[PDB]
Design a protein around this ligand. Structure first.
Ligand SMILES: COc1cccc(NC(=O)COc2ccccc2P(=O)(O)O)c1
Ligand SMILES: COc1cccc(NC(=O)COc2ccccc2P(=O)(O)O)c1
Ligand SMILES: [Cl-]
Ligand SMILES: [Cl-]
Ligand SMILES: [Cl-]
Ligand SMILES: [Cl-]
Ligand SMILES: [Mg+2]
Ligand SMILES: [Mg+2]
Ligand SMILES: [Mg+2]
Ligand SMILES: [Mg+2]
Ligand SMILES: [Mg+2]
Ligand SMILES: [Mg+2]
Ligand SMILES: [Mg+2]
Ligand SMILES: [Mg+2]
Lengths: 228, 228
């Protein structure tokens, strides 16, 4: 439905929607921008990610509330409404994954863009895994793992240990190991090694880069504190 | 779209949606419940009001952000996106006003229900007035005034000065005078008289009623502090 709007106007409106805290609109504008077919700049990739993380975030928070109520109840209403929210969440994840597959990842040749999009792919499969059951569920978990792993492999070859996309990827992959893969030791090892190798590279940074990197290192530290 | 769901299940889901902070869903469930044609109980009237106040609240907050950006800008994008949000806000207000006219107010014979719905009518015309321009605009302002006035007339005849619906009505009508009607003296007089007559009636209240009433009296006091 954004086919008739200029790419530049979609980006401008996404920024307005962010100011207005209208994240559903923000996501729809950025989906429209991606669907123009051109690669996205760093700033535009960040608008895409912020929009969808806020949308899916509201859904995941609601799903958690409902799932809790349902499990303590264990008529059809709680299950029905949890399933409604679950389906809408699945739809948003499928939308994002669709944008990544058609055709953001395939056209992403620079490490910053390719790692960004593979991290996003890992994150949205991870959100699908949170609500998935059984077997179907193993293939979803492995899709998340596979995307994160490819991103990690590129990030380790092509980016310094303090790069904020590399740090955020490692942070989220550690969360995947702790929360999804039942691998708390792998989570803790990854968060530890990532933190230590970033610390050793801080000396190479300007003041502003240092602020960017240490912000994410503090999130790694927060998890490690929660996990140990 | 809620025609096939049981009234009781719509109410139950509205309560779940409130826990989940899913206010759009909450409003749609309560719209469905109203459309069953039966009068609403006190608790159900409160669910209706909470749902729509949160929905329109998000819209009014966004509209304010956008209007500010637009007026400081004064391409078409800011105006266009402010108009989009404005139209959606107008639609929600029209929806609420429609439920009140078809047929909540006409079937409301008790003072608690009739005052509640006439206050709501004043509030949603007030939200339309916030975004309205010119003349069209005078009739909207007078519709809000007229609804609030009828509610006030009934409330003064039928409810004690500490009743929380009477207090909330007076609070909102004072806000209408200050923000919409350019009548700050009327706003201040109304808030003052309402506060003083409630204070004089507190002695008649139980501990829990006292807590309910004094909460709203503090909002009147907060406005008076802001306005004087
Ligand atoms: C963004 O809104 C929500 C809703 C529900 C859960 C969360 N996530 C959290 O509270 C913590 O999640 C993380 C912590 C470190 C890295 C990544 C995440 P995640 O949100 O699971 O991508 C966020
Ligand atoms: C509920 O979300 C919003 C969004 C934008 C504005 C507001 N309202 C306010 O900040 C203060 O408004 C009032 C104060 C006292 C009584 C009534 C109101 P109102 O929200 O204008 O019905 C609320
Ligand atoms: Cl449902
Ligand atoms: Cl490529
Ligand atoms: Cl628009
Ligand atoms: Cl009647
Ligand atoms: Mg063009
Ligand atoms: Mg399901
Ligand atoms: Mg390329
Ligand atoms: Mg490099
Ligand atoms: Mg029935
Ligand atoms: Mg308009
Ligand atoms: Mg009746
Ligand atoms: Mg009475």
């Amino acid at each position: 439905a954004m086919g008739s709007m200029e790419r530049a106007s979609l980006i401008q409106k996404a920024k307005l929607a962010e100011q207005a805290e209208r994240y559903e609109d923000m996501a729809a504008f950025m989906k429209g921008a991606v669907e123009k077919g051109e690669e996205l700049s760093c700033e535009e990739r960040n608008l895409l990610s912020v929009a969808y993380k806020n949308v899916v975030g509201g859904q995941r928070a609601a799903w958690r509330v409902l799932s809790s109520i349902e499990q303590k109840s264990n008529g059809p209403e709680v299950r029905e409404y949890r399933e409604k929210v679950e389906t809408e969440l699945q739809g948003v994840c499928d939308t994002v994954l669709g944008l990544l597959d058609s055709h953001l990842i395939k056209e992403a040749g620079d490490a910053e863009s390719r790692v960004f999009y593979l991290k996003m792919k890992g994150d949205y499969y991870r959100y699908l895994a949170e609500v998935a059951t059984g077997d179907d569920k193993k293939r979803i978990i492995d899709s998340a793992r596979s995307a994160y792993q490819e991103a990690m492999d590129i990030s380790k070859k092509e980016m310094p240990p303090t790069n904020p996309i590399r740090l955020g990827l490692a942070l989220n992959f550690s969360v995947f190991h702790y929360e999804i893969a039942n691998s708390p030791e792998e989570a803790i090892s990854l968060a530890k090694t990532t933190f230590d190798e970033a610390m050793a590279d801080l000396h190479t940074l300007s003041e502003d880069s240092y602020k960017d990197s240490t912000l994410i290192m503090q999130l790694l530290r927060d998890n490690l504190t929660l996990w140990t």
